[PDB]
Amino acid sequence: GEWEIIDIGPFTQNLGKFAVDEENKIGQYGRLTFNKVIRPCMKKTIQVVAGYEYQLYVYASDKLFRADISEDYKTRGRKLLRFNGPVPPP
Amino acid sequence: EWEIIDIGPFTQNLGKFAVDEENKIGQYGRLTFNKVIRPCMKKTIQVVAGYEYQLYVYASDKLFRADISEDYKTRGRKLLRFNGPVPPP
C-alpha cells in the first residue's frame, strides 16, 4: 500500500528528536525532554502526479506517424519524445 | 494508469504541437499537420512527493503522538501535529 511500518531504529529515533525540538519552538507543553520513540512507527510514502505522456496517431503530409509527447503537471511544458513512421493504422 | 481520451481540439492541438516540434529536428522533411485519429492514449506519471511519519514519542515521561512530513526532493522536514498525552499503544 501507501502506508508502511518502520523499525524504531536510529533514523526513527532521530525523527523523534526533531518532533520534540520543533515542539519546544512552539511550547504548547513544557520544555519537553526527549526520551525515546516506541513502536509502532508509520511511514506514508506520498505519491503525486508529475504530468503526463500522450500517445498519438497523427497524419503528417499524408503519412501516418506515432507521436510520443510529454506534458508537465503545473507548467504544462510539453516535449516531443519520439516520432516514427509511417506506421500501420489501428 | 492508461487512459483513452477523445480526439477533440485539445488532442488535435497536441498533434499540431508534435509535428511543429518535428519540423525543428526535421528528420522527415517539412511535414504539414492534417489530423490526429483514434485511439489516443494518456498515461499519468506519478512521482514521489515526500513522506509523512506517524510517531509514538516519549517526552519528559509523557507519551505523545507526533506527525512529521519530510519532502522527497529537498529532505525538508516539518512538524505537522503534536498532541498528548496519549495512552500507550
Could you give the topology of this structure?
The structure is a homodimer.
Chain A: E1 3-6, H1 10-26, E2 34-60, E3 63-72, E4 78-84
Antiparallel strand pairs in A: 1-2, 2-3, 3-4
PDB class: plant protein
Keywords: QVVAG motif, plant protein
Assembly: dimeric
Looking at this protein, list some descriptive labels.
alpha+beta, Single-chain Monellin, 4 strands, QVVAG motif, homodimer, N-terminal domain of TfIIb, loop mutation, domain swapped dimer, 19% helix, 90 residues, Helix Hairpins, four-stranded antiparallel β-sheet, elongated, plant protein, 2 domains
Structure characterization notes:
The structure is a homodimer. Chain A is 19% helix and 53% strand. Chain A has 90 residues and is α+β, with helices and mostly antiparallel strands. Chain A has two domains: 1-46, Helix Hairpins; 47-90, Other non-globular (N-terminal domain of TfIIb). The first copy, chain A, is elongated. The two termini of chain A are 36 Å apart. At the A-B interface, helix 1, strand 2, strand 3 and strand 4 of A face helix 1, strand 2, strand 3 and strand 4 of B. Strand 2 (34-60) of chain A pairs antiparallel with strand 2 of chain B, so a sheet runs across the interface.
Oligomer: homodimer
Largest sheet geometry of chain A: 4 strands, antiparallel
Beta-strand share of residues of chain A: over 45%
Order of helices and strands of chain A: EHEEE
Overall shape of chain A: it is: elongated
Strand order of the largest sheet of chain A: 1-2-3-4
Q: Please give the count of helices of chain A.
A: 1
Task: Kindly identify the CATH topology of the largest domain in chain A.
Answer: Helix Hairpins
Separation of the first and last Cα atoms of chain A: 36 Å
- Structural classification of chain A: alpha+beta
Fraction of helical residues of chain A: 10-25%
Largest interface pair: A-B, 55 and 56 residues
What is the count of structural domains of chain A? 2
Rg of chain A (CA only): 26 Å
CATH second-level architecture of the largest domain in chain A: Helix non-globular
- Would you count the extended β strands of chain A for me? 4
CATH class of the largest domain in chain A: Special
